[PDB]
Ligand SMILES: [Mg+2]
């Protein structure tokens with residue numbers, strides 16, 4: 001009954017489809033994947049431009065004293081002026097090279113002479129083309145500067161701005177609906193708890209996890225253990241326009257667990273048991289919204305750790321696939337254990353760790369190392385605290401010694417890792 | 421005159437100060453650093469809770485047929501009912517254990533008997549405490565679940581919700597003002613460019629870079645090469661409440677470069693020349709806003725590459741330090757070059773690369789590898805395209821062969837790295 005994680009992931013990958021592209025403004029494009037190629041409408045620079053503050057010269061003149069016939073910093077400066085042999089022009093970095101000049105001698109290789117007509121001493125012999133950016137040096141006209149499937153970061157925004165593109169065709173992020181289930185739950189605003197009550201922590205945790213993925217959230221609240229109630233919430237969520245529904249709890253054993261029977265009634269359940277610790281009751285379904293698009297549903301396990309681990313392993317790549325990422329899979333690295341860890345005898349375990357890069361990983365060479373977050377019980381959300389990786393432990397039941405190597409899934413921005 | 425990058429960074433670190441903490445809502449706390457410890461007001465679970473769907477029993481009774489005297493799923497279910505020797509109670513996962521029961525036998529190790537009073541056959545001999553979470557098992561009452569200086573991610577939001585904390589004391593992000601300088605610039609909305617004009621790309625690039633750091637941006641636009649004009653913009657920016665001002669251009673040589681003289685007049689310039697390629701004219705200053713707080717100013721170089729490299733190396737750790745990060749420094753790793761690279765003979769170079777983790781880094785062991793983004797000229801923003809690292813090349817002027825190892829600064833979320 002329990003399918004391997006690799007199979008469950010292949011099923012999710014084959015079912016999930018990229019969202020239709022949209023047109024957004026320049027700053028709305030940040031973080032999104034391009035759905036069109038971007039072409040430069042003009043060259044960069046669009047005019048021969050100086051690399052230095054100095055003088056535009058005729059290289060063959062060589063060292064000597066010359067009159068300064070114009071000054072060129074921007075725009076129309078020096079328009080219609082020709083730098084002929086025996087003359088020079090002052091230029092600032094980025095200034096347009098006047099017609100006739102063929103090199104720039106930086107100001108450090110010159111000296112101003114006299115005082116009232118402007119004259120300069122060129123102190124070196126330069127070569128044609130020195131310290132000039134030719135037209136199209138950096139970007140040629142009609143070059144493809146960005147391509148469909150490329151994710152937009154800060155330099156890509158810079159390239160869009162360079163090319164004068166301020167309305168961009170991209171793949172959008174999915175809209176995600178989230179609900180919690182359970183008669184024992186109370187809102188996280190609750191003070192004193194009554195007997196048999198706990199605060200709903202999964203919903204806020206998932207809202208935050210989805211916010212970190214840059215998706216709009218639809219918070220559907222706490223749903224009680226009543227089939228008709230959950231049916232109504234799920235039906236309205238499916239017809240609301242969301243792309244993904246996340247539930248937690250009420251998906252495994254127990255006589256008031258209605259998520260799985262409702263997903264089986266409303267859509268197609270691809271799996272409901274995965275060979276993994278934590279996360280074995282994870283349920284994945286596809287529901288058709290009536291005209292009419294597809295909605296993906298993840299029936300996440302109720303235990304807090306299980307809920308977040310399943311989100312990290314299955315929901316994150318699904319969000320990325322819907323958002324057009326060509327490489328949605330998580331970064332996996334190899335690392336060395338800083339302490340001994342016992343694997344499970346039946347299920348491959350995703351053991352929470354805090355990893356860091358060290359100059360010596362224990363073997364004399366630089367590498368990542370990992371520390372366990374401690375007890376791994378699925379009810380213990382403190383085992384996720386500060387965890388930036390999931391160690392992929394095989395189902396051997398053996399104690400993996402300190403210094404041994406394992407594969408690890410990196411789950412939090414690797415560029416925000418705390419240094420050793 | 422050119423100070424080493426390590427010295428420039430130490431100066432910035434010593435001058436930069438953590439911002440005063442504020443109180444925010446639960447979801448506004450995501451991404452922020454805690455400025456208080458968080459204590460659990462009650463235990464998790466706050467009642468003895470079942471780990472399984474099954475029956476709460478007296479362990480010493482052993483296998484046998486017993487009447488089901490109550491059912492417990494949440495809240496007050498089973499309140500006042502005592503499970504005595506010779507009786508059992510049905511329980512769902514998370515349900516409160518009735519008084520008198522001391523173990524749970526999961527439903528798979530039982531069978532329902534008869535049909536009309538409820539009776540069950542317990543098929544195993546269990547042990548006291550099996551499949552029960554004692555009060556405080558996961559979190560003890562008054563335990564510190566989160567500490568001052570801890571960054572809040574999704575699991576931390578979950579822990580805040582668990583503890584009923586929905587108003588959180590955190591360090592805020594800095595507010596950042598951004599402007600571009602130059603008579604040659606036009607807005608990125610411009611179509612056909614006139615002679616000697618280019619689109620302003622640095623400002624949008626920096627707005628995006630600051631957005632990626634989760635800071636509010638104040639966009640001050642294009643400023644022309646006029647001392648009084650820039651003075652007015654800088655003066656108003658300083659008194660606006662921002663914490664950081666970023667300029668680009670007009671900071672090195674040239675007779676219409678007013679950023680450096682204005683920073684020297686209005687505040688204290690700590691350095692204006694750094695021994696690095698690109699980025700050597702980087703200028704750093706502290707300005708006092710009149711009552712009255714300190715404002716940090718970075719006079720970034722005008723060349724697009726230089727502008728973003730300096731942002732990545734100097735501004736990012738400054739943002740993080742202001743936002744209370746205890747480890748603001750960028751992740752540095754060791755990696756192997758996939759192609760030969762020529763270092764500079766005078767300045768240590770921050771060479772743009774696209775890095776990835778490989779199962780074989782070329783030496784037979786897993787590791788990061790790097791490819792150059794190509795020509796590294798500072799006017800060529802295409803050299804930043806897709807770059808996720810800066811290779812730290814020493815100032816040797818030698819060709820570093822393919823297969824050699826270098827240090828690299830990771831500049832983009834390592835958990836969003838495209839896999840090999
Ligand atoms: Mg439940």
Ligand SMILES: [Mg+2]
Nearest residue numbers: 601602669670
């Ligand atoms: Mg300028």
